[PDB]
Ligand binder design. Structure first.
Ligand SMILES: C[C@H]1CCC[C@H](O)CCC/C=C/c2cc(O)cc(O)c2C(=O)O1
Ligand SMILES: C[C@H]1CCC[C@H](O)CCC/C=C/c2cc(O)cc(O)c2C(=O)O1
Lengths: 264, 264
């Protein structure tokens, strides 16, 4: 039975969060769009292996929109990490396994490095480390132009699974619609240079498991593969592209549980 | 002005070859389809920077089809490397820069390792190290079935540039048509295990420059990126996929000249 509720933290954020299961804590941090419905099936599937799974909409996104501006403008990994630590503090999650893609991947690595006592192990997927001008240039467009362009880009280029993307439903896509402008203005310029992945050695020997999408063009996260290999960090593939939890929920869920079981 | 001619070597092969330019030798070794007209523009463009450029159809392929069966069945990097050393012997090329993609990539690294006195530097692109059952399954079909399927697969999936691929013309596509079966039967089972990349320390400090296609799915050559990084070998991207010399001739040519100038 899934808890669907709100909890507030003293940095001014009111988080929408979901929680199911009993057992060691596993936390699913969204990608930049900040929408935790993307995890819905995997929440249940990972919980059914004996885990308490918690996820949430990210600050300023979807149903966690009640948040002050610093929390969704000039966003950095280090900022997100501290927001995530504060919602963990509120929910009394002391020791967590954490997953994150994209800005969520940067967040989890910054969590692992900054709060090692708190993080049992971290799985990061497709960690952005490069400025991408086609994304960054949308910031200066009109809100509805941004939503049209980014919605299309997710649907056609990066979903990894067009049908599964569209099957999330109208409600989700209506929340994403409003998030695309806030993401565009707040994330693409400032997340990449915040990447906590330039000190290779600090990554060495850490409980970190890195993935890239199998179908993602080799150029997008070529640099993740080099960096992981130079740091001896485990690196592999998940099917699909930027949203394996949408396109391949069953393999995603099994990967989270199997990687979590390694570190208990 | 380009030389277009044949030369026979004592392993029973009659090679079709082309050559243009004066200067240090640069040799362009085809991919598995063995068809050197794919290089035509780049031959002129690299020569025009002060190089003597040589290429050729590969044994059993295209206009180098007069060759004994061992030269195009159970093909191996080590076999292809000896075949190319013989055509270089015949043509009196003592020192060469070499390029190769796919089976050509395996050939060039085997050349570099096996004949270090002969190879100034090698550029390998998308070196196949894994058995691929969808490719190997085509071996047991009808010849004309194999040509249909592979001609379509190159056109639509892996050219990196559909217009540029088709613009090579009817003559080249008529030669490829006959090569697809010979390749299917001779290459995909035996070329991957022959990959000369399993000894990391032999690669280290060698004049080797490795590339993968930018648009190629991450999974196809993930392993090349890990291997290069573990051996300190330079590794980067070219635009397109499996045939940058077809899809992006100008940037391919400039990459060959620049990388050759580094080592000269
Ligand atoms: C939401 C998702 C966008 C996917 C399409 C993007 O085109 C995928 C490109 C990879 C980088 C995305 C990205 C970059 C960035 O600077 C900050 C981010 O939060 C992301 C990110 O979260 O990626
Ligand atoms: C002809 C070229 C493109 C084949 C499409 C392939 O589907 C592209 C995937 C990479 C594999 C290429 C390949 C594998 C191999 O074991 C031996 C080979 O000679 C090649 C190779 O030459 O591939």
């Amino acid at each position: 039975m899934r808890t669907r509720s709100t909890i507030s933290t003293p940095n001014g954020i009111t988080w929408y969060y979901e929680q199911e299961g009993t057992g060691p804590d596993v936390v699913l941090v969204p990608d930049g769009l900040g929408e935790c419905q993307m995890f819905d099936s995997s929440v249940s599937q990972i919980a059914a292996q004996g885990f308490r799974v918690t996820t949430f909409d990210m600050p300023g996104m979807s149903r966690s929109a009640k948040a002050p501006p610093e929390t969704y403008t000039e966003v950095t990994a280090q900022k997100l990490a501290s927001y995530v630590i504060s919602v963990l503090d509120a929910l009394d999650i002391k020791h967590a396994t954490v997953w994150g893609c994209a800005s969520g991947a940067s967040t989890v690595v910054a969590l692992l490095l900054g709060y090692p006592d708190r993080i049992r192990n971290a799985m990061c997927h497709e960690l952005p480390t490069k400025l991408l001008d086609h994304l960054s240039n949308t910031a200066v467009l009109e809100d509805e132009e941004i939503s049209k362009i980014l919605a299309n880009h997710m649907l056609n280029d990066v979903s990894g699974g067009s049908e599964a993307w569209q099957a999330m439903g109208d409600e989700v896509h209506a929340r994403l619609h409003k998030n695309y402008p806030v993401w565009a203005r707040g994330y693409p310029r400032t997340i990449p240079p915040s990447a906590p992945v330039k000190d290779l050695e600090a990554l060495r020997g850490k409980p970190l498991d890195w993935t890239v999408g199998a179908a993602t063009p080799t150029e997008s996260f070529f640099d993740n593969i080099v960096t992981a290999t130079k740091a001896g960090v485990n690196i592999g593939l998940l099917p699909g592209m930027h949203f394996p939890y949408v396109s391949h929920p069953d393999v995603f869920a099994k990967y989270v549980v199997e990687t979590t079981q390694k570190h208990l």
